[PDB]
Amino acid sequence: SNGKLIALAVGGAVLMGALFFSVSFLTGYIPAPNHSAILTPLRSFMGWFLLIFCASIIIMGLGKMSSAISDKWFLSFPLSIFVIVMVMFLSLRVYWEKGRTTTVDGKYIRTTAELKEFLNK
Amino acid sequence: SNGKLIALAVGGAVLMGALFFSVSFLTGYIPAPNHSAILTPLRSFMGWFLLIFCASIIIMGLGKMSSAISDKWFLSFPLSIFVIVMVMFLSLRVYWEKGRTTTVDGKYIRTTAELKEFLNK
Amino acid sequence: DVTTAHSDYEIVLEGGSSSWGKVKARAKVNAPPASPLLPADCDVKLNVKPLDPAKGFVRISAVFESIVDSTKNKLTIEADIANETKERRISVGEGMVSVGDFSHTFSFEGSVVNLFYYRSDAVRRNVPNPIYMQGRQFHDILMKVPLDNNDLIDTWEGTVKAIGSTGAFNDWIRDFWFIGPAFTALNEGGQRISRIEVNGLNTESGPKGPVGVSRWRFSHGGSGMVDSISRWAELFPSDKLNRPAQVEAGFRSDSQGIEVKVDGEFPGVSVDAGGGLRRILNHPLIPLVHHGMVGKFNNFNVDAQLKVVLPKGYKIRYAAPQYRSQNLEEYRWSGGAYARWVEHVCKGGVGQFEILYAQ
Amino acid sequence: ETRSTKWYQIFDTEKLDDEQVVGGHLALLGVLGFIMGIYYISGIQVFPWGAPGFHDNWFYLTIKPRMVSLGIDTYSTKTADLEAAGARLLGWAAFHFLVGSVLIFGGWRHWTHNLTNPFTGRCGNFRDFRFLGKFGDVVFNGTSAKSYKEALGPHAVYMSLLFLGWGIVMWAILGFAPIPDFQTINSETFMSFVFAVIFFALGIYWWNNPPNAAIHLNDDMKAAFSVHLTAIGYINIALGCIAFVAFQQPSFAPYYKELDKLVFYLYGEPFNRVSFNFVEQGGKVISGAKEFADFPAYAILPKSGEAFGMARVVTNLIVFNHIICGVLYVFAGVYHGGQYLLKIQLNGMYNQIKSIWITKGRDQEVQVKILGTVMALCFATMLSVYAVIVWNTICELNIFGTNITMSFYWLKPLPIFQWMFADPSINDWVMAHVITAGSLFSLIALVRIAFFAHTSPLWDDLGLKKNSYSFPCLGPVYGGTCGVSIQDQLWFAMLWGIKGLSAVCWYIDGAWIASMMYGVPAADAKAWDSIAHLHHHYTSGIFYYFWTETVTIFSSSHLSTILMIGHLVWFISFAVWFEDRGSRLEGADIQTRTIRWLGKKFLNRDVNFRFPVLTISDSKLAGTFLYFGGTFMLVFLFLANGFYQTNSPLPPPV
Amino acid sequence: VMALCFATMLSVYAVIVWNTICELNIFGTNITMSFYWLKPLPIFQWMFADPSINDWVMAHVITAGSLFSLIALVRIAFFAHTSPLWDDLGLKKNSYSFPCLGPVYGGTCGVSIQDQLWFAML
Amino acid sequence: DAAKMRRFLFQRTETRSTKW
């Protein structure tokens, strides 16, 4: 697990990136409006690569921590887990969505009567 | 498999039918139009009794012939299956449905255009 | 309901005065064997080589390699049989008998005498093909088995003790010699086994170890059915042995059935029939009468083909049952009458099937 | 020696001879003719006497475009031209009844070895015969084939004779002269004679010189029967592939495309309903309310062929049938073939076979390399294509801040291959790679049967042999060894095959395969048709397929009964496929004792039943049958609910 | 427990199946022949709002669904070490998480109490 | 290499052992 073992993974991923990047020119597809021909395969390749990388890391990580959990993890593991949901809830209200939604003017809707009436206007 | 063994099954079926009929006179359910109070329960029990009875005979019948089939059934089994299929197609046109679809006047409709015209008018 | 037999036969004959014929037989049967131990398999080999023409002596060999209920059994024989006279025939030979981890060798000096109760000219004259001839055979036996094993010694000691204490040894030995159903075979082929006669039971020293020696003599009579008696001259074509002759056969048996393979050339397959006409040798009666004993236990359907190949210029003058097809030099038998005659003779029938082929 | 007295092994090749085989094949083609004569009677739209005919059935729809092609059946809307058609179908149904009765008679006597004809009073020989008298004497030098290899020439001749006969039948009875132009049915007579010439010439070359290839196949009936089944399955797959391209060609329009224009009344389809208080009288309906009022009470209602898309529904029912079977027969050819490789490894004839079809894979060294290439290519392909489908699903659902622009819409088959698809799109790139991955996946279970029937690189390591073909496992030893026999590897080929067997069903029903979710009312599901300029609107996505296709299934009272029955059968396979066989054995014991105890106390006489439980190998058998039968009892509903792909794409909702 | 589970899983399933057959007009049967008249007795009517056959079936389904998974629970309580069958077959259940004893006796998979726990959850 | 290979399957067995 050193030198060429990681180089093959990185080099293998890179050469694969060119294949799709080169395949897109071969396909000669009509691109989506306001989107560069070079950009469409690069975006598609990064997402696919990220998905495979994520699956591999999750499996290896669970295997590494599954047999390494002892009496010493009695406090650290439960604290770290609240540290995933905690940073996730903050991220949900900071990155994923900013605020409870409001109208373009900035008004709120929390009643069926308001929803029954706001939609009419 | 004689005397009381088969006596018991008949007694149980009669008891279940009587209970289904008896419970109704006190269930307090409004009967369907042009239907007898005594008939509704009797018809429902017969349908329920037939489903278990048909399932039970099929289970023991398949079992009886699974351990009693050999080289001698090489001709009889394929002929019996064909005979059942044949007496079945005849039932489609002699009991289930008499003739192809026809109108009150006795006319036929075999074309999409003829149908489309029928749908509109 | 029924079973089915499938079999193939073949006889190739030469022209001139040659009695040489090649016989091949393949069979496959789906019913269980009558043997009370299965599986039982067996391979047999016979080879006869002429030693000298003037003497008439020949060297015969026999090897038996049979596995019975996982028990390896082997019997080996090497002998020198020659014609002394019309009724006497002396044989000198050696052999070995091995069962599992047990084995013992033997050497024998023996002569067989064969006499016909009558020899009349009218029979000979009035009969063109005689099947039954009434007769008797006498065997002179000088067995030489070395007592190498602990068990051999005990079998010998016991034998001598039994003779000494039991007056009925000559009679009750026939209950041992024919083991299980072989005794019932005796009455079946109309064959009578006479009481054995012990000339001497003396232990004589040999260079290897003590050698129990038996000098016995017996007789047996055939009502006519027995082929050894009725056909004494025909079963030894020594003088017709211009070249070595070999018969090789084998069979496999178990709960499922029997598989049999047989092949080999030998003289005497063709014999003169009179009026310039040749004919296939009359079927041996003892094998048929002996197979009806085990062949009557399962209803079977017969699938047998008998391909007969004749010499150039040689066609058949008459056959019953008639050949289904002819194809140039070769003639074929299958189906119809022939597959009735096969069911006849596989169940013990001895009905005649005659082929006459003239140049 | 494992038991073989099971009811489903009664007709095994071990228990039959060459003569019995011929009898068995004949005893079925006669039955097949009887079956074919019932698919003809049912197709009578109006009887010869003028009484109304039989309602549409799926068994006659898959053959109606053929009988129309041959002139026995017509598409005419007039009863006068539809009254003659009925008489013809009666003629061929009665004719197939007569010829079938002859083949059964010539199969019963063949099976009983009783080849005797009363008129000639002579019994024929199976070992050698002239073959149709003088005709065979001139061609086979007056002799018959003595082996499977020598049977190729005579067998090829028979094929030439059958082809010549079909050509004569089309010309004389059906009136189709052999004109050699490939847009008319008349070209099926011209090539019926060209093929009869090729086969006859090929049948003579193989009789004079019998083929030496696969010499060991002559020795065992199952060895040759399995190679034939590995070959017949591939042929059947090719027939399914060819019938899809051809049945919707312009030249086949008069027979397949013409179905759209007709009104079909299938049995079990929606019928004119009635009110609860309905009292029908002979002359008229009294004090009752009946729907439609255009047909009689309880009469099957019409169905527009064009809306249904019957031309493609019938094309699919036939194309899928010859593919569901073609892959089943390839699986069985390897199974029944490895079933023969176990015997030659047990009685040890394997190391002495010189055939390169057995000698090539002799060494374990190559076996791991061959299986390691099927296994590595299946991994690099079932992942490359699954991650594309998953990524496309993520991009259009707008999951993880992604959009349909970042999806694989720009990926499609290369220009060299574009001719293979009417409309090229990512739905076509994915389907080719899914079938490639779906074949290499189930090929792993097949290479295992071919190479590891008796001993594996692991069992040779663990010091074990696989004595049987139907042994469930070797106990819980070494952490567990279940599903190691070739019969179980056959099950894992049938089970793994259900994916490519479903990528076909989905792809021929006009569904989307490049995304789990296509056409749902979500963020970018309906933005596919315009992001990739699709000229067709696919019915739905992999998951949304179940919702849309089933709107028509729930409307039918018979298509929905199949849905129920098919699901009921399938989950029951869990009972015999889960590792609960030990639990079932105990449970039953309680049931036997319980029933014995109940009978004892309740009745003076004591009656016991000793309830039985299936074995694992007998469980995995009923398990795969319940799993496979259940899984394709319902695939029929996807194909027979209608073809709902359209040639108009959807604009983005925005 | 097994007898009660059987007489109740077959009595209520055949009602649901019969109602399904009557509603789809299979075998020429109208919804009139179905169990639309069967509903909880008057004594129990207080347990339900708008009592109907949907309520009679649900009570019997839960009764059947409890007695079904109770079989796997009575077996954990009574056959943790030995069962009438394994005392007959001369075997000991040494363990709570042992998968099977192997192919022997037509096989004996899923016999431990951990597996009987799985068949209660399933 | 059989032994080394078996030490592994033995490292993942159906017998009593400590699990996470």
Ligand code: BCL
């Ligand atoms: C089976 C009917 C008769 C029989 C028939 C004959 C015949 C016939 C003659 C002998 C003669 C002899 N018999 Mg006597 N013999 C029988 C019983 C016995 C018994 C006994 C165990 O009871 C003994 C110890 C003997 C002993 C002897 C020998 C002294 C002598 C030579 C045998 C030999 O070499 O065989 C060799 C060892 C073998 C295993 C051969 C077996 C051959 C089988 C029986 C037939 C094979 C031939 C086949 C059909 C055709 C083959 C053609 C090929 C060219 C070979 N017989 C019974 C009662 N016996 C011979 C003689 O005259 O000596 C002077 C001789 O010609």
Ligand code: BCL
């Ligand atoms: C289903 C998945 C597999 C399959 C798996 C099995 C299994 C499992 C078994 C056989 C067995 C047999 N198979 Mg196979 N077999 C398949 C396809 C075929 C086809 C074909 C239609 O192409 C044929 C001609 C055969 C031929 C045969 C015989 C050599 C043999 C005994 C048949 C019998 O008695 O059936 C039963 C007889 C009947 C009258 C019942 C109805 C059978 C109908 C006619 C279909 C025949 C084929 C079918 C698979 C037979 C088995 C049914 C069992 C329920 C599995 N198989 C496919 C590829 N086959 C047995 C054997 O001895 O193998 C060495 C065996 O144990």
Ligand code: BCL
């Ligand atoms: C044989 C058993 C049954 C039978 C069962 C069937 C079946 C099954 C079918 C028909 C169908 C037909 N039958 Mg019918 N039929 C029988 C007897 C007859 C006889 C007669 C001479 O007695 C006649 C005239 C007919 C007439 C007909 C036509 C009405 C119709 C179309 C035939 C066709 O396309 O042929 C074409 C025939 C040939 C060209 C002969 C050559 C076939 C070759 C040998 C197969 C090769 C295919 C494949 C590639 C194999 C490759 C392996 C090797 C490399 C060759 N039947 C008997 C009673 N009949 C068909 C139908 O109704 O379709 C809707 C149909 O599918």
Ligand code: BCL
């Ligand atoms: C479609 C007919 C079926 C069939 C059904 C029958 C029928 C029916 C009968 C026999 C019977 C016989 N069968 Mg068959 N059998 C078939 C295939 C064969 C083959 C083969 C491997 O090709 C052989 C060698 C045989 C062998 C034999 C004969 C030896 C026997 C003769 C008695 C009789 O009436 O004979 C006349 C026949 C001959 C003397 C043999 C030579 C002529 C050919 C081989 C006979 C079969 C029909 C022929 C092939 C049909 C036309 C083919 C065209 C392409 C349409 N069958 C054909 C394919 N079989 C008979 C029987 O069982 O009686 C109780 C019988 O009546």
Ligand code: BCL
């Ligand atoms: C960018 C390269 C893409 C790809 C894009 C295409 C395109 C574009 C086309 C095909 C087409 C085909 N593809 Mg593809 N294909 C890939 C990988 C595979 C693999 C595989 C498991 O390695 C297989 C068996 C197939 C199979 C097939 C055939 C159905 C067909 C053959 C011609 C061809 O590829 O021409 C073109 C081939 C190339 C330009 C280069 C091929 C490079 C080889 C295959 C190495 C790539 C494999 C890679 C290592 C997998 C990654 C695994 C990782 C280790 C995780 N492809 C990779 C993922 N494929 C054609 C078709 O008909 O589609 C419907 C087509 O037009």
Ligand code: BCL
């Ligand atoms: C006609 C009789 C019907 C039936 C109709 C009713 C009715 C009506 C009511 C219940 C209700 C209940 N039912 Mg119920 N119930 C039956 C059978 C069962 C069985 C069973 C497996 O034997 C069980 C465990 C239950 C369980 C229960 C409880 C949830 C509740 C208890 C009061 C009660 O039954 O009062 C009334 C009980 C009776 C009038 C008689 C009970 C007879 C006993 C219990 C067994 C009947 C015979 C047996 C089923 C024979 C079948 C053998 C099979 C053919 C193998 N029923 C049979 C099939 N059941 C009540 C409820 O709240 O429902 C929502 C309710 O109102």
Ligand code: CLA
């Ligand atoms: C509908 C599905 C179904 C049915 C009816 C059963 C029934 C049964 N199971 Mg099973 N099981 C199933 C699914 C099913 N199981 C599945 C999916 C699994 C995998 C998790 C298992 C796993 C399993 C184990 C591990 C064990 C059983 C056991 C049992 C039996 C003990 C319960 C009893 O005595 O009476 C229960 C009550 C009844 C059976 C009443 C009958 C219910 C209906 C009316 C049956 C008839 C309908 C049927 C589907 C008809 C088929 C039609 C056809 C078209 C398919 C019982 C026969 C135990 C046993 O003793 O084995 C013998 C046992 O140890 N079950």
Ligand SMILES: CCCCCCCCCCCCCCCC(=O)OC[C@@H](CO[C@H]1O[C@@H](CO)[C@H](O)[C@@H](O)[C@@H]1O)OC(=O)CCCCCCCCCCCCCCC
């Ligand atoms: C079970 C175990 C493994 C599974 C494999 C077994 C089943 C395989 C059975 C073949 C299945 C085919 C079905 C009928 C043929 C048919 O469809 O042919 C037409 C055409 C499209 O036609 C139109 O279809 C419309 C439907 O939506 C579209 O909308 C339209 O645009 C398009 O033009 O399809 C191809 O070109 C076929 C694609 C697959 C390409 C094959 C690639 C495989 C070749 C390479 C090697 C594979 C084998 C590897 C070794 C095992």
Ligand SMILES: CCCCCCCCCCCCCCCC(=O)OC[C@@H](CO[C@H]1O[C@@H](CO)[C@H](O)[C@@H](O)[C@@H]1O)OC(=O)CCCCCCCCCCCCCCC
């Ligand atoms: C692991 C296996 C088991 C799984 C777990 C099962 C435990 C749950 C335990 C059943 C309880 C369900 C809980 C939710 C409460 C709830 O629903 O209570 C209200 C009421 C209806 O309310 C309204 O519901 C509407 C919805 O459609 C209607 O439309 C309306 O008409 C009706 O009024 O339901 C009953 O009365 C409950 C019926 C079941 C009757 C229980 C009968 C069991 C008693 C007898 C013995 C059973 C145990 C046997 C031994 C194992």
Ligand code: SF4
């Ligand atoms: S549960 Fe079945 S497959 Fe698993 S070890 Fe036990 S017998 Fe083998």
Ligand SMILES: [Ca+2]
């Ligand atoms: Ca559809």
